[PDB]
RNA sequence: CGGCCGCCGCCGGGCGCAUUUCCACCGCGGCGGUGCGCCGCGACCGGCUCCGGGACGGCUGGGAAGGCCCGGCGGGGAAG
């Protein structure tokens, strides 16, 4: 949940404990990002228009 | 500075493909922008310009017709 992200089991057949990650850090942050993933907002896609 | 805790770097360790990092290819999955050039389409919204159907209130509680007209008084145009 917080120490890990999702669920530690697996890996480390010998050695220590078995902890795995999911949805890790970004490996590359672009030098300038744009905001606000656009949205639905009431402008429905073509699948749902009225024939 | 002694001590407290955290962080970072270096080193030494167990260590194995479900740990990790790197790569090439499919998923062309979730998301961000975007096409090479020419186009088209649908729906929501704003702004107009029009078209077609309705239903209603008043008036002199509308005027005047339209319909079935019957028993009388007259008058006036012009009646096979």
From Swiss-Prot:
- At the top level, the lineage of the source is Eukaryota
Q: Which residues carry this modification: Phosphoserine?
A: 40
Indicate where the modification N6-succinyllysine is found in the sequence: 7
The listed locations are: Cytoplasm, Cytosol; Cytoplasm; Rough endoplasmic reticulum
Q: What is this protein's function per UniProt?
A: Component of the large ribosomal subunit. The ribosome is a large ribonucleoprotein complex responsible for the synthesis of proteins in the cell.
The entry sums up its family as follows: Belongs to the eukaryotic ribosomal protein eL6 family.
Oligomeric and partner information: Component of the large ribosomal subunit. May bind IPO9 with low affinity.
Q: What is this protein called?
A: Large ribosomal subunit protein eL6
Q: What organism is listed for this UniProt entry?
A: Oryctolagus cuniculus
